[PDB]
Design a protein around this ligand. Structure first.
Ligand SMILES: *[C@@H]1O[C@H](CO)[C@@H](O[C@@H]2O[C@H](CO)[C@@H](O)[C@H](O)[C@H]2NC(C)=O)[C@H](O)[C@H]1NC(C)=O
Ligand SMILES: *[C@@H]1O[C@H](CO)[C@@H](O)[C@H](O)[C@H]1NC(C)=O
Ligand SMILES: *[C@@H]1O[C@H](CO)[C@@H](O)[C@H](O)[C@H]1NC(C)=O
Ligand SMILES: *[C@@H]1O[C@H](CO)[C@@H](O)[C@H](O)[C@H]1NC(C)=O
Ligand SMILES: *[C@@H]1O[C@H](CO)[C@@H](O)[C@H](O)[C@H]1NC(C)=O
Ligand SMILES: CC(C)C[C@H](N)C(=O)O
Lengths: 605, 31
């Protein structure tokens, strides 16, 4: 522990705290009640990452062998980290940039990296909401637009790439995205996805026009919608035909998969993404409470709703994957029934699923020549329960195909999509606080303009930057970017926050601050994880990133409706200028911490 | 004969753009 020369006379001094809180009734905002603070915090951490990144990661990492690492890493990094953020913001009375600059003026890179990773994550995260709004506008009609193929110029048959693929794939790839065959060629601005973008940003600027006290009632109405629509969706999903078969696929572990490095990196980067750690929004939200506030009750209540939800969503998601894998298996197996009774002319009430293997041997013993030209499809479950459930391929290709087979199918589309919208809007409330607040402590705007001018300003900029995701190649830009700026940037900052509190500030000084606020010292469970355990697990997951960055090939999926063996996946390699993009998106952030440190130490010299 | 998605967009973008000119004039007529 460095003695940190001049730590006092920079922070409040543990008896000024009762005095400074009675004079901040007009400078800094407040919460209305305690329930407005809890619904803002657990609405920032849920949604769009329980549906999009979790089941996409869960199939690859052992089918259902992703729930072990996840849970353990959660309870071992998640808890400790989330608890360290609620307590360092409540005492230091500042945002994200004001906390880490009062714990040595060299660690100002953590406030500038938490601002740059909140701008780049929320750049593409508000594009997924504009795709959700496009699917909500396309409801309110009983023949749903993704339920049938269009016809040719000559009205005789369907379009050639709607006949080979699904009609749900000819609404996402060709009628929504209008996707191209590579990332190296981009088309035009695609005006109908521009309007939606505008819509999204406009709706985001209406609720956060003044920071807190507008985000309040919003959080109210949006922390209920999401929670009650999921429950209405649970008793529908378990009543389906093929359910309780994708649930068993979620819970049969593949224990060989638990000994790979890449299944602990994706589990470790999901905890710092599900919990909104290393963003700086949960420090600014906890900096508005009173000093005598139990910040330990709040950190273990929010964490057991965040852990319970990520399993509660995953058994709703996998109850409709098992329903598509029974609709497809009963249609592939009905193909083998109908192709046998048409080649040998049998009645229909004799060949069924109980004796298909009995009677196909009877057909080659009767006519060995007429049986040779027949074809028999080879299909069985665990081949339909393991498919391409890639990014933006579950809410748009898996759910929207299953909704069109329920009765009252326009009703289950609206509900579902509004639910997704809510889940994704309430997480952009706190993500706007990670950009507005440290840009307001930097003194770059003249401090007589209102708060509603800076906010609007930011919005415009981000909307004008969101034009790169509306091109023809705009889905290939969102994947790459997504993954990279969502994996690297989290881990580094998360580790810098745990180190600088217990080894630069001081964990023994920090225990005097907890005893003043909540009434007692932290337990022995908080002492081992802060000093020994969790700094280490993080320091580890950080070496697993370079083990799997090397010894892998950068590939991405390509649609290409001229490629032979069309509807299966085709993976080609990235161009050589993608390292410049990757570099920027996952460098700027990290090079920022050491960057500023160096800068200041130099100013020293 | 119009694309039902443009009507629902026109109602939703209409109730947003008038909701910002209430929340801007309230702020002013409030400070
Ligand atoms: C359980 O996970 C292991 C680890 O990935 C799987 O083993 C892989 O199987 C594929 C296809 O057979 C091979 O290409 C890989 O080389 C295997 N991995 C290793 C490390 O050898 C295994 O298939 C999974 N279990 C099941 C039932 O699929
Ligand atoms: C299909 O119909 C169009 C008329 O719009 C015609 O130009 C085209 O040649 C037709 N295609 C074939 C294969 O007949
Ligand atoms: C996108 O759609 C337009 C018409 O809506 C069409 O002219 C263009 O060729 C499409 N782009 C691709 C790559 O097919
Ligand atoms: C179909 O016909 C065969 C031969 O007549 C018979 O053995 C079989 O039981 C029939 N299947 C039925 C009645 O389901
Ligand atoms: C008929 O085909 C099966 C394989 O489908 C084969 O095992 C069997 O020997 C064949 N019978 C004759 C008489 O060729
Ligand atoms: C925009 C992000 C801060 C949202 C957060 N990662 C979540 O999925 O809850």
């Amino acid at each position: 522990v460095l003695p940190n020369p001049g730590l006092d006379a920079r922070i409040p001094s543990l008896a000024e705290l009762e005095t400074i809180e009675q004079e901040e009734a007009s400078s800094r905002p407040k919460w209305d009640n305690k329930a407005q603070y809890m619904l803002t915090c657990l609405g920032f951490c849920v949604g769009l990452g329980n549906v999009w990144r979790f089941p996409y990661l869960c199939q690859s990492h052992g089918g259902g062998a992703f729930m072990i690492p996840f849970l353990i890493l959660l309870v071992l990094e998640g808890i400790p980290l989330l608890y360290l953020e609620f307590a360092i913001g409540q005492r230091l009375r500042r945002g994200s940039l004001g906390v880490w600059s009062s714990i040595h003026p060299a660690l100002k890179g953590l406030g500038l990296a938490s601002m740059l990773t909140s701008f780049m994550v929320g750049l593409y995260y508000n594009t997924i909401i504009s795709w959700i709004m496009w699917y909500l506008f396309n409801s309110f009609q009983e023949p749903l637009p993704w339920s049938d193929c269009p016809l040719n110029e000559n009205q005789t048959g369907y379009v050639d790439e709607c006949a080979r693929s699904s009609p749900v794939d000819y609404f996402w790839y060709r009628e929504t995205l209008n996707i191209s065959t590579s990332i190296s060629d981009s088309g035009s601005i695609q005006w109908w996805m521009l309007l939606c973008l505008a819509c999204a940003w406009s709706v985001l600027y209406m609720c956060t026009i003044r920071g807190i006290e507008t985000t309040g009632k919003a959080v109210y109405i949006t922390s209920t919608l999401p929670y009650v629509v999921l429950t209405i969706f649970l008793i529908r999903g378990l009543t389906l035909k093929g359910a309780t078969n994708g649930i068993v696929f979620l819970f049969t572990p593949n224990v060989t998969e638990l000994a790979q490095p890449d299944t602990w990196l994706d589990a470790g980067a999901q905890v710092f993404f599900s919990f909104s750690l290393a963003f700086g929004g949960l420090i600014s939200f906890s900096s508005y409470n009173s000093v005598h506030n139990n910040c330990e009750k709040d950190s273990v209540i929010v964490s057991i709703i965040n852990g319970f939800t990520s399993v509660y969503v995953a058994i709703v998601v996998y109850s409709v994957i098992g329903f598509r894998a029974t609709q497809r298996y009963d249609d592939c197996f009905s193909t083998n029934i109908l192709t046998l009774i048409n080649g040998f002319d049998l009645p229909e009430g004799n060949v069924t699923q109980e004796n298909f293997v009995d009677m196909q041997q009877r057909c080659n013993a009767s006519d060995p020549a007429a049986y040779a030209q027949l074809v028999f499809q080879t299909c069985d479950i665990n081949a339909f329960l393991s498919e391409a459930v890639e990014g933006t391929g579950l809410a748009f290709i898996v759910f929207t195909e299953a909704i069109t087979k329920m009765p009252l199918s326009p009703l289950w589309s609206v509900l579902f999509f509004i639910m997704l919208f809510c889940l994704g809007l309430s997480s952009m409330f706190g993500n706007m606080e990670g950009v507005v607040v440290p840009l307001q402590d930097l003194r770059v705007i003249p401090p007589k303009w209102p708060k509603e001018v800076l906010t609007g300003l930011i919005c415009l900029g981000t909307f004008l930057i969101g034009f790169i995701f509306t091109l023809n190649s705009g889905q290939y830009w969102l994947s790459l970017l997504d993954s990279y700026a969502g994996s690297i940037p989290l881990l580094i900052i998360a580790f810098c926050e745990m180190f600088s509190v217990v080894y630069v500030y001081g964990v023994d000084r920090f225990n005097k601050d907890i005893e003043f606020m909540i009434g007692h010292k932290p337990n022995i469970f908080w002492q081992v994880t802060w000093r020994v355990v969790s700094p280490l697990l993080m320091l580890i997951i950080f070496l697993f990133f370079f083990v799997v960055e090397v010894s892998q090939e950068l590939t991405y999926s390509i649609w290409d409706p001229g490629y032979e063996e069309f509807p299966k996946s085709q993976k080609i390699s990235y161009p050589n200028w993608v390292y410049v993009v990757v570099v920027i998106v996952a460098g700027v952030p990290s090079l920022t911490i050491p960057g500023y440190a160096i800068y200041k130490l130099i100013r020293n010299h | 004969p119009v694309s039902i998605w443009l009507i629902v967009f026109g109602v939703v973008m209409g109730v947003i753009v008038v909701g910002i000119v209430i929340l801007i004039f309230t702020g002013i007529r409030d400070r």
